[PDB]
Amino acid sequence: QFNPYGDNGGTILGIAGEDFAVLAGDTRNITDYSINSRYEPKVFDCGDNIVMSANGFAADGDALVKRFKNSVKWYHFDHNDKKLSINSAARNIQHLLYGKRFFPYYVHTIIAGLDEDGKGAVYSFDPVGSYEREQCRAGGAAASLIMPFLDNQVNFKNQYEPGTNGKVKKPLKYLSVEEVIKLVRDSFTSATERHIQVGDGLEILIVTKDGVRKEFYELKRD
Amino acid sequence: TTTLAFRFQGGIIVAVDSRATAGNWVASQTVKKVIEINPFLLGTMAGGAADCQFWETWLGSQCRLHELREKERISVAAASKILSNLVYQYKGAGLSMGTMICGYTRKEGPTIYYVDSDGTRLKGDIFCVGSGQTFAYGVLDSNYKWDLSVEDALYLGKRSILAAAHRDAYSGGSVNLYHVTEDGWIYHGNHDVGELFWKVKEEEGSFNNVIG
Amino acid sequence: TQQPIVTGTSVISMKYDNGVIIAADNLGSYGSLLRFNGVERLIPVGDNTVVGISGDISDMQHIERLLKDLVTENAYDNPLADAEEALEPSYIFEYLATVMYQRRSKMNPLWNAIIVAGVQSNGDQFLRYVNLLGVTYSSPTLATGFGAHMANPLLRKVVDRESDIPKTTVQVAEEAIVNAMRVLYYRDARSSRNFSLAIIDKNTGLTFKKNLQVENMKWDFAKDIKGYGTQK
Amino acid sequence: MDIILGIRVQDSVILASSKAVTRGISVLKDSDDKTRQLSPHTLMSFAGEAGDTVQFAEYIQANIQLYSIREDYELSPQAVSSFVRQELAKSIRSRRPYQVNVLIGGYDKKKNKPELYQIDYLGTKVELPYGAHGYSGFYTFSLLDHHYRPDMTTEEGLDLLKLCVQELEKRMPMDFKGVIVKIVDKDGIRQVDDF
Amino acid sequence: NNYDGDTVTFSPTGRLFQVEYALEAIKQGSVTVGLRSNTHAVLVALKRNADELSSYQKKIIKCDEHMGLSLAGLAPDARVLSNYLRQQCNYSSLVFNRKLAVERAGHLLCDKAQKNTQSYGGRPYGVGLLIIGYDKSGAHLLEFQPSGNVTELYGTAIGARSQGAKTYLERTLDTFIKIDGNPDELIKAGVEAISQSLRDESLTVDNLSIAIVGKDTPFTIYDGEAVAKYI
Amino acid sequence: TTIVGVKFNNGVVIAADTRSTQGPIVADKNCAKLHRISPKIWCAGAGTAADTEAVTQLIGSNIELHSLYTSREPRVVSALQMLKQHLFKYQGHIGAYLIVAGVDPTGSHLFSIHAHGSTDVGYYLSLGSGSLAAMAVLESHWKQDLTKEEAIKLASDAIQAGIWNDLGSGSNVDVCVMEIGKDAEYLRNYLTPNVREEKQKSYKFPRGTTAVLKESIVNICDIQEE
Amino acid sequence: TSIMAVTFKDGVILGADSRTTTGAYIANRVTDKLTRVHDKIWCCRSGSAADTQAIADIVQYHLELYTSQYGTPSTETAASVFKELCYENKDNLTAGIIVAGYDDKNKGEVYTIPLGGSVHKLPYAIAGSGSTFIYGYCDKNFRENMSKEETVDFIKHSLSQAIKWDGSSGGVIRMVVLTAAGVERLIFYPDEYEQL
Amino acid sequence: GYDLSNSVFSPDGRNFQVEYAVKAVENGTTSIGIKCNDGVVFAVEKLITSKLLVPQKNVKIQVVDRHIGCVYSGLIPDGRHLVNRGREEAASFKKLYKTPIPIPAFADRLGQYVQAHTLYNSVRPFGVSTIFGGVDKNGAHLYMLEPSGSYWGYKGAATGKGRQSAKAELEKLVDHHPEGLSAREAVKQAAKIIYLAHEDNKEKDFELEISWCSLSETNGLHKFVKGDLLQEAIDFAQKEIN
Amino acid sequence: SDPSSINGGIVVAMTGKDCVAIACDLRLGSQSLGVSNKFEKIFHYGHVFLGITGLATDVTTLNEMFRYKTNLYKLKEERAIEPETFTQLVSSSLYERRFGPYFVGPVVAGINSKSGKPFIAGFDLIGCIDEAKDFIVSGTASDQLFGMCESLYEPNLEPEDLFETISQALLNAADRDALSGWGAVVYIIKKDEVVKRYLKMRQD
């Protein structure tokens, strides 16, 4: 018997700003308990201020990135160098997924960038299609250690003005990129201990409207 | 996951929850199940998220193109019996669906048709579909008036989604309401389920199961 | 559908300052019955790229063919078109990659794992992996099969990261690949004493050292212990 | 499967279909019909598999009416019956199974006799003086045989059929919320709102 | 229709006349000039207005970010081949992890012309393309004919008054080959080239459409007021 | 079911039983398992009866086509290689075990062909379920070159071993003797055991001893002037 | 079912037996499994009785057409054929063939094709299901380079150890001798080597 | 009037279409093939018809597999298609038999494919003479293939405009050596006989290209003659004509 | 379950001297539920009589399949179909599907008009001629029948000797069966006039 699906593990984290978006994920690649590669990105820039990761099972992840970077060339070609929006990209991916659902894909996709209001964008996707815009969503292996922490510290969840005993919500957080950079790394340094498919290298792609910033940061190899 | 919609004399109150899961933990808590087919057609995502969302968006392709050829937008019967065949072919090929197409036209009045993975196309006046559809059915049918105000009809909307949130594992998060008139839907806010809870317990005295 | 019938063991390999070394042992096993001896699973394509194919010999034959055909396709048109529009390791990689993947998709896999080892026209190291899922990845140390976590741990202990590569010399690399064959030949039940070895350098090209033998074994101390610890 | 009974009265066929519709574990609707008039003088009621029923039922009205308008005359119930048989017959051999059990009742005004037919899911046509499919069939086949006479007036056929309804309700573990009644007769195809 | 028929005829002169006829497509088209150095290729195209309320007709199509084509002749014909060159380039990027080189793409194209001359119910395409690019083997400029011949040149033209552009390029030939890493100079010498190929339609900063390719620069198309630095 | 095929010097002799069974019940005490590919190339079949008879008909038609198209007498191989090819196509979802034997200008032949697409050659072969019981007598008594009269007594007594020991074999013993450059003789019922005894009385009933319900006549004659 | 081939200085001699079981029941005990597909490229069949006969007709066909247009195919050439049918039907055909044959220039050569289908040139090959037992006997007492007389006694005794241990191997031993000189069948009945 | 289709016959045995296709090949350029004992030497004349051209950057001699040179004249695009087909047919042989296609076997595939286009009205006959040969293990061979789908063995063959002259000089060279000459020595003679074959056609100016498949110097693979060897061959011919 | 055993159905048939006889029951069930006490399963195409057994639907489908082909022969060759040719045809039709097969057991009964001779045949599921000139029976109480008929039958039966034999044989067999019975209809087929008689027997 043949079963075509594996796993390559890893985790990603898309945190939508109000003037940026940040897509970060670990560069470790594993197949069970053997470490396949330390450092080999799962996080890609796809040109014209949209970034792309398809994390889960690497063999699919490759193919789905390569068809997206084809659908950029073909837009420039047939629409006369029109810029391709985050919003239009989101849908276009879902066809890519759906077309082979009868044979399933097994990757979670988070794309990010800036759209035409100049707000942060994150769309996250389920494997068999569908997408939803959210301000923050984690994905991949270690996601569920990451997400309730992220929902606490960004969106200020279950937090309340002191001395009224929960009758006024604590006032919402105005994002800026520097608080956000510190935050990514603190959250990851924890996941890496407690979850064994994360670690090694961390690659933070930042999108701003001025260009795409690549800031690499090491983690422990524990 | 629970969806419902009801006829009354003012139109169709369509109400949904905003929580869905995967596994056993809550995958999204902002996951809006109101899928705009058209400015005059709402479709309600239960069953497989992928299948529902994609196909209802493509339904809106065939609603927009029908309207170009015949110069008059689609009847609710006619839109539903587009969807039914589509589904039906992917029968014995494996699909998942569980939508209501809710529409108000001037040739058919309010109409709701329920479409299912099996390929039933059923008419009716109250349709509650989903994992928690038993908890919805109840609060909805016990305070059912065809002679109903639009203010009470929202407030009824809310309390059938909060029954559904309270007992279903997989329902809750937030509540969206849309009132479909003839002139199409108008959006009545996003109201957190968490935040909603304590105001209804305060008013009605209900929820005497949960400690003060 | 397809499953392993006749199989090879393990391909091991590592990066060094001016290139790559890659070696594989010469065995065609038919389960426990060691049916085929003197079967070589290193296959040179070009003259700076050695493509070592692991998994089944059956499937291997039909990839050995496609490498020879690719060299023929490339060589077409101009005399400048084989001088410097020659195949590169990164080109060879993708070609093998893309076929395997599509055969996995149609549910009849080409059951191999492949390592493509070479050096660029730009003058850079390339050591990369592909398999029967279509997973791709690059690393400074690589292996396949049972040496994926037998031999590989030893090699990765020499060169931990890609910046320790200019500090490691071609003769220290040489040692590690011999040493790790010896560890294979010990602790793995399908292994052969014969191994082929290749050195790809970017200053002298490909030199192919064939039919080295694993020498310098220890077997002195298995006369000082006896039984399962109950009979002396 | 639910309620679907025929009784061949002297001059008419009285068919009745369940109101209740349960898909999943919750009754969702309870005034639905399961019958579609083929031609002015042939009615067809159906039950079987969910969703197979609704589509395949629309399919036969379409085709028989296609032929009606070609010849400006209507097929006999014997002739429509054979068409429905033909199709389902191809369908148990074919890749996707249909599973539709039908009572086709009609008044043929050219033989001048009411005709009642039972087509099971396998594809067997049989002429009968009373009939039924499924779960309901098991209690009623014997109940109708008891009291019947060869010639019975129309309002006698109603009274009998309401004995059969009444019985069913006690005995079946399923709930069906009463039937809808339709008479197919020589004077057209009407409903009775009395249950 | 004697010997002069459809694509199946010989013709006691060894010709087929379908080929000469499609080469009048080109002649009835507007002029274009290509010229290359060892570090840069440059195409300098004359667009053509239909009337003064009509615009100017695009004459240069981008195939890749290091490969481009510019047509001369029938626009519907061009669009069947232009789709084709971009399609096999993305194919070569996908499969071989490699740019589709200009010289090789001339060979691919060549056989695509041939089989509509082979088959009865075919016709040759009535477009000739000039194809530049910069690859791993450097600059190339190909001249493609309705015949299906691909030829490599230092500078050529096709159009009307194509003779007048080539005579300018025969003098100044050894000057532009030894200008390298100064793209500006090549652009101006080609402006100057197409000056001898005017029907008194003038040099104008919306009539002339430029596209360049470098070693050090992607394929880029200058149009509108990106051409004013030469003009 | 014992069906033997035994070569001897001047030709080949093939014998069979005529008891054809369907599970614990004897369907028919009289059919024949011997078919005719061609006039001097007889064959018999064993295993699923439908799949023998249809395969023999099917390929029978095609070697006769061919035999006109060469304007020549058919050869044993001609039939044999067509067989082989056909059964292989379904991958042995067809279950035939035929002895194909026959003479022709270029000598005596005798093959056996199994349900997948296997083929063997010997000088004494047997198929059937009784095959085992045949085979025992065959291996002792046989010897190289027999005469015709000897070959028919070996053949018959080999099926009889079959009858006695194998339940599913019984009835008459047919023979068809094929001998090079003389016509092929069918000797149906050569030696017949398994004669049924006379009933102890007869069971004839007089009229009206079964009830009648009503009477009508069915008219099978064509439609005519009234 | 035991099949072997052994190369010698002036050619190759091929060796098979004649017992072929299905079950416990010996179908025919005088079976011939050494087959002509050309005229100096002979094969030995082992494996599934249907699947070897099937494949082997299909090669007979390809090779003879090769003769008629192009000139005689080589041992090399024929070996490739058998691989190219096993490899593309490896999912459902259980066939291991030994293709041994005499090229003019290169004398006798042996190629063996596994079930999965692949060329292997060998100084001698054994495959079957009763030839698993003689891997040690052939290997040790194999002298590279033998004479015509030496070769036949070596293979006779190799087949006798294989017969002794496998109840699917017995009967007479069939040999084909392929040399420039021609094609010679030899046969040994059991009384002639069970004494040795 | 028998040019309507390429399946028609004429009462003089002619098939007008196909004969007119030879007119197409006569407008080619001189192309030779030298059957030597060690191998084969092909050469093609490449006209420089403009000084705007980039010399030695266009080939009219392309290999098919690695040991069959194919050099064509007539319609240059049309030959690029007939060469293109024989790479498919050649590769099919190698897959199916694991041996590179023999030269007489390749002769048949190409021949048959050209013959085919006169048996259907759906296609046009090719107007080229193609010249192909190489070294196989049954030795070196040479074939000239007609646009008619006809071929024969040749001890030397030629095509072009200067074909009267070439075929003529090639008789002289087979009358110098009845036992034939080295492919080493043939590099310098292809140079010589294209040069005398251009006195008819001396309007233009040309670049000489030469290629070889020899067992003795290019180890049976078809490689290009280049470097000092190429420019010495040019110099040889020039001294001969002066 | 088994496809034949989902309505039942038996056909018995025997030869006499200048007469054959065929006979069936009338039951059509859907498993345990008896659905109808009348449904002829013998049908007649000219002067051949076709008995059809096995699976419920396939009595109906396969009958009208023969309706279509009999017609093509009668229209073309301008005569009614002979017993022997129709036996061949049934064999050919059953085999047409062998993957996704029929599930029926026909009985061909007739008397040739070209020579005045009885001819009967039998069939299995996949379909093969089963010769006799004694008797053939088919169905699912075919087992019970095979015995019953053997005891009773005597070579050369007279026309209304043949009627008592086949009527009793069938009666006893069907009431030792669940899925056949509920009435029986016996044809006596002569050379000029075929008589249809229903038989009064146990319903229960």
PDB file of C-alpha atoms in Angstrom, chain C residues 70 73-74 76-78 80-81 84-87 90-91 94-95, chain E residues 93-99 101 103-104 107 135-138 140:
ATOM      1  CA  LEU C  70      18.666  15.225 -20.240  1.00  0.00           C
ATOM      2  CA  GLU C  73      18.557  17.355 -24.788  1.00  0.00           C
ATOM      3  CA  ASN C  74      20.878  20.124 -23.429  1.00  0.00           C
ATOM      4  CA  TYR C  76      21.508  20.346 -28.707  1.00  0.00           C
ATOM      5  CA  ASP C  77      22.079  23.525 -30.818  1.00  0.00           C
ATOM      6  CA  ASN C  78      25.350  25.559 -30.565  1.00  0.00           C
ATOM      7  CA  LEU C  80      28.485  27.268 -26.850  1.00  0.00           C
ATOM      8  CA  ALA C  81      25.479  25.336 -25.649  1.00  0.00           C
ATOM      9  CA  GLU C  84      28.612  26.949 -20.820  1.00  0.00           C
ATOM     10  CA  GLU C  85      24.811  26.185 -21.314  1.00  0.00           C
ATOM     11  CA  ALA C  86      25.648  22.853 -19.758  1.00  0.00           C
ATOM     12  CA  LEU C  87      23.534  21.210 -17.026  1.00  0.00           C
ATOM     13  CA  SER C  90      20.435  22.926  -9.548  1.00  0.00           C
ATOM     14  CA  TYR C  91      18.926  22.072 -13.037  1.00  0.00           C
ATOM     15  CA  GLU C  94      14.504  20.028 -10.463  1.00  0.00           C
ATOM     16  CA  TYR C  95      14.285  17.605 -13.282  1.00  0.00           C
TER      17      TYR C  95
ATOM     18  CA  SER E  93      11.467  28.038 -15.099  1.00  0.00           C
ATOM     19  CA  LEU E  94       9.224  25.427 -13.534  1.00  0.00           C
ATOM     20  CA  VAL E  95      10.852  22.138 -14.853  1.00  0.00           C
ATOM     21  CA  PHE E  96      14.514  22.903 -15.330  1.00  0.00           C
ATOM     22  CA  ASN E  97      14.982  25.758 -12.887  1.00  0.00           C
ATOM     23  CA  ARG E  98      16.408  27.714 -15.778  1.00  0.00           C
ATOM     24  CA  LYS E  99      15.711  30.804 -17.996  1.00  0.00           C
ATOM     25  CA  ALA E 101      17.433  31.169 -23.654  1.00  0.00           C
ATOM     26  CA  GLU E 103      18.793  31.054 -29.163  1.00  0.00           C
ATOM     27  CA  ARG E 104      16.988  27.904 -28.088  1.00  0.00           C
ATOM     28  CA  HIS E 107      14.534  26.660 -32.605  1.00  0.00           C
ATOM     29  CA  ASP E 135      20.925  35.167 -20.661  1.00  0.00           C
ATOM     30  CA  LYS E 136      23.753  33.147 -19.243  1.00  0.00           C
ATOM     31  CA  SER E 137      25.318  33.159 -22.741  1.00  0.00           C
ATOM     32  CA  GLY E 138      24.818  36.949 -23.107  1.00  0.00           C
ATOM     33  CA  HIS E 140      21.140  37.839 -28.680  1.00  0.00           C
TER      34      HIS E 140
END
